[PDB]
Design an enzyme around this catalytic site. Structure first.
Site, mmCIF file in Angstrom:
data_model
loop_
_atom_site.group_PDB
_atom_site.id
_atom_site.type_symbol
_atom_site.label_atom_id
_atom_site.label_comp_id
_atom_site.label_asym_id
_atom_site.label_seq_id
_atom_site.Cartn_x
_atom_site.Cartn_y
_atom_site.Cartn_z
ATOM 1 N N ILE A 1 0.647 6.397 3.905
ATOM 2 C CA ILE A 1 -0.297 6.359 3.061
ATOM 3 C C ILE A 1 -0.623 5.013 2.472
ATOM 4 C CG2 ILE A 1 -0.147 8.781 2.478
ATOM 5 C CD1 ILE A 1 0.979 7.889 -0.286
ATOM 6 N N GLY A 2 0.119 3.929 2.837
ATOM 7 C CA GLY A 2 -0.231 2.732 2.375
ATOM 8 C C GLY A 2 0.752 1.810 2.600
ATOM 9 N N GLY B 1 2.681 -1.108 1.027
ATOM 10 C CA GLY B 1 2.848 -1.656 -0.300
ATOM 11 C C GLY B 1 3.109 -3.124 -0.404
ATOM 12 N N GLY C 1 7.089 -2.730 0.787
ATOM 13 C CA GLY C 1 7.339 -1.877 2.240
ATOM 14 C C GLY C 1 6.305 -0.644 2.233
ATOM 15 N N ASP D 1 0.949 -7.091 -11.444
ATOM 16 C CA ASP D 1 0.278 -6.992 -10.419
ATOM 17 C C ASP D 1 -0.691 -5.801 -10.314
ATOM 18 O OD1 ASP D 1 -0.662 -8.169 -7.884
ATOM 19 O OD2 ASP D 1 0.909 -6.945 -6.576
ATOM 20 N N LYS E 1 -4.047 -3.968 -9.696
ATOM 21 C CA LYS E 1 -5.056 -4.247 -8.556
ATOM 22 C C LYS E 1 -5.736 -2.701 -8.348
ATOM 23 C CE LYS E 1 -1.426 -5.215 -5.147
ATOM 24 N NZ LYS E 1 -1.056 -6.177 -4.476
HETATM 25 BR BR1 LIG Z 1 3.576 5.740 -5.631
HETATM 26 C C1 LIG Z 1 1.900 6.564 -5.100
HETATM 27 C C2 LIG Z 1 1.524 7.803 -5.126
HETATM 28 N N1 LIG Z 1 0.369 8.221 -4.697
HETATM 29 N N2 LIG Z 1 -0.046 7.118 -3.817
HETATM 30 C C3 LIG Z 1 -1.219 6.830 -3.259
HETATM 31 N N3 LIG Z 1 -2.072 7.905 -3.194
HETATM 32 C C4 LIG Z 1 -3.283 7.770 -2.604
HETATM 33 C C5 LIG Z 1 -3.510 8.162 -1.067
HETATM 34 C C6 LIG Z 1 -3.652 7.240 0.075
HETATM 35 C C7 LIG Z 1 -3.847 7.667 1.370
HETATM 36 N N4 LIG Z 1 -3.506 8.946 1.719
HETATM 37 C C8 LIG Z 1 -3.307 9.536 0.578
HETATM 38 C C9 LIG Z 1 -2.986 9.144 -0.656
HETATM 39 C C10 LIG Z 1 -1.391 5.623 -2.434
HETATM 40 C C11 LIG Z 1 -0.366 4.644 -2.893
HETATM 41 C C12 LIG Z 1 -0.592 3.142 -2.064
HETATM 42 C C13 LIG Z 1 0.396 2.433 -1.908
HETATM 43 C C14 LIG Z 1 0.237 1.236 -1.189
HETATM 44 C C15 LIG Z 1 -1.099 0.755 -0.818
HETATM 45 C C16 LIG Z 1 -2.110 1.755 -1.099
HETATM 46 C C17 LIG Z 1 -1.863 3.155 -1.696
HETATM 47 N N5 LIG Z 1 0.626 4.717 -3.511
HETATM 48 C C18 LIG Z 1 0.952 5.882 -4.037
#
Ligand SMILES: Brc1cnn2c(NCc3ccncc3)cc(-c3ccccc3)nc12
Length: 290
Positions: free
Chosen positions: A10-11, A13, A16, A119, A121
């Site tokens: 989902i991302g 980070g 990581g 940080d 954003k």
């Molecule tokens: Br803790 C965390 C809890 N939910 N979450 C979400 N949820 C949003 C999402 C995005 C895509 N698909 C499903 C839910 C995104 C990110 C994230 C982390 C790093 C980069 C971008 C988003 N971190 C988190």
């Protein structure tokens, strides 16, 4: 980690990959972050008690095989995606106001416990169907540091960085988070990033071109800062009416106090909550397409 089943990425980070995962036991759906020096373990462990409705809940910390995993509460969408999605029409002012108000409550809480985000954003501001917005990754910067590039080599954005950090202040304060949130507030209103710098000097000069090159008058001590150079160009300050139209006077006034150069003078989260801009605050429900 054998207690979790990854569902999907989902991302990407700072530290990581972030996965949506299911606790193979309780069935709980969570966000699992892959990230160890003892200081980091102690610092992170402390964040488990830093609980507030506008802070994404840190459920657990898992340290195994010298690998570190953070288990968080899951939210369905982030503000970057929501803003992209709302580009054509913009986010309604009452919703922007509610979001800002909630984020200020989260900051006031964290800041009262002397915990900084450092940080902020749009990618780490998470939203749900109920109209809530929450801050993710609070405290991680002090624990792990803030890299120039992510584990993926992606550039860590400078767009929301406070000027004192850019000028080399080593011991910056909770004011750095107020600056970032001001930048995010302006971006929600205008539908364009306020200061989209692509290097440290570009970021600084973009701030100077809009807010004026800082001097001893507006920011006592600025000329002594580590990275300050007397050769910086001297640009004049622009009116906020030009910067964030068509935000009203109350909003422009608040934004101006969140973007004060002198961190000592910059409005605190607690004082911001009392600003007249929040006199008519409400909690609208966003339209989420999941
Ligand atoms: Br803790 C965390 C809890 N939910 N979450 C979400 N949820 C949003 C999402 C995005 C895509 N698909 C499903 C839910 C995104 C990110 C994230 C982390 C790093 C980069 C971008 C988003 N971190 C988190």
């Amino acid at each position: 980690m054998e207690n979790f089943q990854k569902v999907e990425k989902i991302g990407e980070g700072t530290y990581g990959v972030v996965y949506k995962a299911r606790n193979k036991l309780t069935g709980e759906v969570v966000a699992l972050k892959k990230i160890v020096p003892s200081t980091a373990i102690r610092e992170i462990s402390l964040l488990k008690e830093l609980n507030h409705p506008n802070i994404v809940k840190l459920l657990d910390v898992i340290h195994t095989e010298n690998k570190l995993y953070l288990v968080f509460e899951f939210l369905h969408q982030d503000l970057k995606k929501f803003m992209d999605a709302s580009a054509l029409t913009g986010i309604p002012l009452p919703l922007i106001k509610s979001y800002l108000f909630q984020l200020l409550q989260g900051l006031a809480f964290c800041h009262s416990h002397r915990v900084l985000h450092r940080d902020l954003k749009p990618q780490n501001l998470l939203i749900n169907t109920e109209g809530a917005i929450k801050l993710a990754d609070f405290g991680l910067a002090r624990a792990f540091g803030v890299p120039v590039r992510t584990y993926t080599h992606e550039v860590v954005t400078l767009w929301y960085r406070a000027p004192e950090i850019l000028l080399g202040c080593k011991y910056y304060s909770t004011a750095v988070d107020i600056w970032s949130l001001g930048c995010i507030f302006a971006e929600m209103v205008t539908r364009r990033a306020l200061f989209p710098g692509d290097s440290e000097i570009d970021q600084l000069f973009r701030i100077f071109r809009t807010l004026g090159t800082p001097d001893e008058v507006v920011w006592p001590g600025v000329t002594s800062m580590p990275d300050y150079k007397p050769s910086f160009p001297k640009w004049a300050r622009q009116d906020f009416s030009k910067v964030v139209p068509p935000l009203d006077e109350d909003g422009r006034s608040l934004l101006s106090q969140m973007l004060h150069y002198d961190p000592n003078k910059r409005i605190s989260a607690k004082a911001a909550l009392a600003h007249p801009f929040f006199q008519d605050v409400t909690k609208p429900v966003p339209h989420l397409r999941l």
